[PDB]
């Protein structure tokens, strides 16, 4: 699967995660984007996290949808530049 | 090993982790499920975590039982859909 | 490299991490063991973390020594049982 | 790609992350180094994290630049010594 296709999937995941967190949890766009990266990279600082049942479910789906996508994208990125 | 077999193993891990956290730590079913995903994906926000010696041991076993299972499942999921 | 050799390396890493955290940071043996697993699996809840400069350095070495060892051990464990 | 080349890339990532966190977030050099390792290993305790919009953006770039680099370095390190 081409690296650029994976990148597009990662972009869609970022949109999904950011919009989801902002509207379900009510955080700013900037915090939501930052939380999305932190979550899909599996860093998970816990400075931000869902506080509602829907936010928690949503976060599980994001984890399922995003962690593999992101992992493959970074390693393809690594190959590409190096 | 077939992707669906791995999925079943991941499901059993989720049951194990959720029930374990709920009964050992006393959190709600919903929090326990969410904590299980967050732990086996290695996100680990720390909004929830074990507060007893048995919960801590249990979490170590979950980590050992769940992180590999979950990693293989997501990457097999990725292959399957893409 | 044989799976059992890797297991022994993981055991040594666990001893290293546990003893280190207990004596440098002053946490209980049980907390230190739990923190070691949580760190080398990269879960990192942040319920426990080093609060001194030596603890922070030590944690960086543990991260370097432990995360690869642990990752290979779990995947070898997965292959072995499945 | 030679292991030593990867090591150099990891070193540059560490400089990038440490200096960035220290100057953008204002933490000590020691905390910033420790935070950099904790972030690029994806441990993410959350004892330290960015509190400004620029720090959050910067952390996303560090995550993108550092997690793949670091993962490949540790596994190459593992092969080399074992
Ligand atoms: Na974390
Ligand atoms: Na945390
Ligand atoms: Na992680
Ligand atoms: Na983590």
**DSSP conformation letters of A4-65:** HHHHHHHHHHHHHHHHHHHHHH---HHHHHHHHHHHHTT---SSS---SHHHHHHHHHHHHH
Does B67 reach chain A within 8 Å, measured CB to CB? no
Does C45 reach chain A within 8 Å, measured CB to CB? yes
Answer yes or no: are the C-beta atoms of B8 and C81 closer than 8 Å: no
Distance in Å, alpha carbon of C59 to nearest chain B alpha carbon = 17
Q: Maximum CA pair distance of chain A?
A: 42
Q: Which residues of C39-67 are buried (b: 16+ CB within 10 A; e: fewer)?
A: bbbbbbbbbbbbeeeebbbbbbebbbbbb
Distance in Å, alpha carbon of C9 to nearest chain B alpha carbon = 15
- Note every long-range contact of A8-17, with CB atoms under 8 Å and residues 24 or more positions apart, other chains counting: A9/A69, A9/A73, A9/B82, A10/A69, A10/A70, A10/A73, A13/A40, A13/A62, A13/A65, A13/A66, A13/A69, A13/A70, A14/A40, A16/A62, A16/A65, A16/A66, A17/A62, A17/A66
Tokens 């055991």 sit on residue: C11
Q: How far apart are CA A81 and CA A78, in angstroms?
A: 6
Q: Residue D52, Cα to own-chain centre: how many angstroms?
A: 18
Q: How far apart are CA B59 and CA D44, in angstroms?
A: 17
B68 closest CB neighbour out of C42, C43, C78: C78
Phi/psi at C27 (nearest 5 deg)?
A: -80, 165
- Among residues C44, C46, C37, which one has the least CA distance to residue C18? C37
- D45 contacts in chain B (CB < 8 Å): 46
Does B1 reach chain C within 8 Å, measured CB to CB? yes
DSSP D47: S
C24 C-alpha to center of ligand 2: Å?
Answer: 21
Burial of D1 (0-12, 13-18, 19+ CB in 10 A): exposed
Q: Which residues of A55-75 are buried (b: 16+ CB within 10 A; e: fewer)?
A: bbbbbbebbbbbbbbbbbbbb
- Other C-beta atoms lying within 10 Å of the C-beta of residue A10: 21
Tokens 């030596």 sit on residue: C54
DSSP B26: -
Tokens 């931000």 sit on residue: A48
Which CATH entry fits the domain spanning D1-82: 3.40.309.10, 3.30.1330.40, 1.10.287.70, 3.20.20.140? 1.10.287.70
- Among residues B3, B40, B1, which one has the least CA distance to residue B20? B40
Answer yes or no: are the C-beta atoms of B66 and C77 closer than 8 Å: no
- B64 contacts in chain C (CB < 8 Å): 37, 74, 77
DSSP D46: S
Answer yes or no: are the C-beta atoms of C24 and C61 closer than 8 Å: no
Query: What tokens appear for D13 in the block?
Result: 């990532």
Query: What tokens appear for D22 in the block?
Result: 């220290």
Q: How far apart are CA B35 and CA A46, in angstroms?
A: 12
What residue ranges do the domains of chain B occupy? Answer: 1-82
Does B41 reach chain D within 8 Å, measured CB to CB? no
């Amino acid at each position: 699967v081409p690296a650029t296709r994976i990148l597009l999937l990662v972009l869609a995941v970022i949109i999904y995660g950011t919009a989801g967190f902002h509207f379900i949890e009510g955080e700013s766009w900037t915090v939501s984007l930052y939380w999305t990266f932190v979550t899909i990279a599996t860093v998970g600082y816990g400075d931000y996290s869902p506080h509602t049942p829907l936010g928690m479910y949503f976060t599980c789906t994001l984890i399922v949808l995003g962690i593999g996508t992101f992992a493959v994208a970074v390693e393809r990125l690594l190959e590409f530049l190096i």
